[PDB]
Amino acid sequence: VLSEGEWQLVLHVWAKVEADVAGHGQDILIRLFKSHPETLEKFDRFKHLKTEAEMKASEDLKKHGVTVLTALGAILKKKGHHEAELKPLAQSHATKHKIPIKYLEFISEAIIHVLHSRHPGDFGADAQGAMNKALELFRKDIAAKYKELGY
Numbered sequence: 001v002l003s004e005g006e007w008q009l010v011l012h013v014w015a016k017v018e019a020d021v022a023g024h025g026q027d028i029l030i031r032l033f034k035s036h037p038e039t040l041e042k043f044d045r046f047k048h049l050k051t052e053a054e055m056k057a058s059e060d061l062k063k064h065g066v067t068v069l070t071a072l073g074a075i076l077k078k079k080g081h082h083e084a085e086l087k088p089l090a091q092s093h094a095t096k097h098k099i100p101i102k103y104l105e106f107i108s109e110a111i112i113h114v115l116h117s118r119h120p121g122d123f124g125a126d127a128q129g130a131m132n133k134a135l136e137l138f139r140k141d142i143a144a145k146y147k148e149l150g151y
């Protein structure tokens with residue numbers, strides 16, 4: 001489990017993200033889609049986007065970026081007790097969206113990359129390690145529910 005100190009590092013940089021949820025959301029999804037094209041195919045709404053420029057110009061994509069980061073933010077603030085927030089997400093992503101745990105690892109990588117680019121001063125090695133731990137916890141817990149459902 002994460003220590004109190006680790007959670008503080010996570011929430012300190014996350015407070016910076018919430019200052020511009022929409023901007024971060026775009027960068028993260030675009031990074032995810034460009035680095036792992038198979039993830040873009042999971043979105044009927046975004047399949048038509050064939051270039052980074054098209055992705056950046058999509059208001060709909062920007063809208064989803066906010067939805068994603070807002071859900072993640074709520075989870076992170078619950079620290080070591082995010083059971084309630086995780087249940088709905090795990091269910092929909094396992095049964096409706098069909099998102100393998102591997103894709104969650106991909107988006108975790110996208111999140112860390114963007115945080116480094118936008119907040120280097122509050123995202124040094126210690127903070128980076130802490131965020132990695134928090135995102136690993138997120139994945140592990142979702143994985144547990146996936147195994148439960150048999151996905």
Ligand code: HEM
Nearest residue numbers: 039042043067068071072088089092093097099103104107
């Ligand atoms: C940080 C990790 C993620 C969070 C917090 C997150 C959160 C959400 C939320 C809140 C919704 C809308 C409500 C719902 O359907 O449950 C959603 C929808 C969706 N997510 Fe995620 N998601 C994450 C990662 C992913 C990944 C990695 C993929 C695909 C590779 C994905 C694919 C989808 C799809 C396809 C939908 C449905 C979109 C629609 O029909 O409009 N999500 N996600």
